[PDB]
């Protein structure tokens, strides 16, 4: 299918109780493979998938050096964002950065991004051309006009449209049993008596990869969303994901309903029905 690589960075100020908690995690599709925690003893960039271990020490040396750069950059942007917004040293704020690239079935470049938020709000983002910037507000304008005058989108575009794509591929070849497997959802249905007159059907997807799934309920062929309850797609912690939808139905009417399951490891959609 398509694939993506995406680095997520989280910096959190403890005003005068040390220096900001900085956390960085890299991901190929929905597999994390690297992390860095400021409060970690190692102060290294660190493997969290087997395939990446096989890379040599210069890959590890340099990744440590670069990620310590993102940290200091976050560490400064907090102090600068306090000014722009005229906030008070007596208060913990958060900055978040997210950037990566997607490749198609062919693994050619598809799209890149470079997002940035202050205190859980959109601040500045590379638009899709990767030759301009979206501001959230007037602070951003100032930042965008520093990034216009220093040619930042061009520099970014060179990473995302080049090196992101070349390394994502590399990783994809090296983790071929992990990253390039399509583990199909293993499905079943279950039944609970909620009350006298009514019952719940729950429709399960388990042990699937990647996370992207669509779990759909029908009644006589017509999509029913009213009187359902979808959970968000969660992990089992073995790099497989899970999910269920349910409906409350009238007692006896249960023959009529059907849950419908679409995932890329399923050669054709699955239907389940009660009885």
């Amino acid at each position: 299918g398509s694939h993506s690589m995406r680095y997520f960075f989280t910096s959190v100020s403890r005003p005068g109780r040390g220096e900001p908690r900085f956390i960085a995690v890299g991901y190929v599709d929905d597999t994390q493979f690297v992390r860095f925690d400021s409060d970690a003893a190692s102060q290294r960039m660190e493997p969290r998938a087997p395939w990446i271990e096989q890379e040599g020490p210069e890959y590890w040396d340099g990744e440590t050096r670069k990620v310590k750069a993102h940290s200091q950059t976050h560490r400064v942007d907090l102090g600068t964002l306090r000014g722009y917004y005229n906030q008070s040293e007596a208060g913990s704020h958060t900055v978040q950065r997210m950037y990566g690239c997607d490749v198609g079935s062919d693994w050619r470049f598809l799209r890149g991004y470079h997002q940035y938020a202050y205190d859980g709000k959109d601040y500045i983002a590379l638009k899709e051309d990767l030759r301009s910037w979206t501001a959230a507000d007037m602070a951003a304008q100032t930042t965008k006009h520093k990034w216009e005058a220093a040619h930042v989108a061009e520099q970014l575009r060179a990473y995302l449209e080049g090196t992101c794509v070349e390394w994502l591929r590399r990783y994809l070849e090296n983790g071929k049993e992990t990253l390039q497997r399509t583990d199909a959802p293993k499905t079943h249905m279950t039944h609970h008596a909620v009350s006298d007159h009514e019952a719940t059907l729950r429709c399960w997807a388990l042990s699937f990869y990647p996370a992207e799934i669509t779990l759909t309920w029908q009644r006589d062929g017509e999509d029913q969303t009213q009187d359902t309850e979808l959970v968000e797609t969660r992990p089992a912690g073995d790099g497989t994901f899970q999910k269920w939808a349910a409906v409350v139905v009238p007692s006896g009417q249960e023959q009529r309903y059907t849950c419908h399951v679409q995932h890329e490891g399923l050669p054709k959609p699955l239907t389940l029905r009660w009885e």
């Binding site: 993102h70 722009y84 500045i124 970014l156």
Partner: peptide, 9 residues
């Protein structure tokens, strides 16, 4: 591979 463009608000 992490990017390498360090530029600040």
């Amino acid at each position: 591979l992490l990017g390498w463009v360090f530029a600040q608000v």
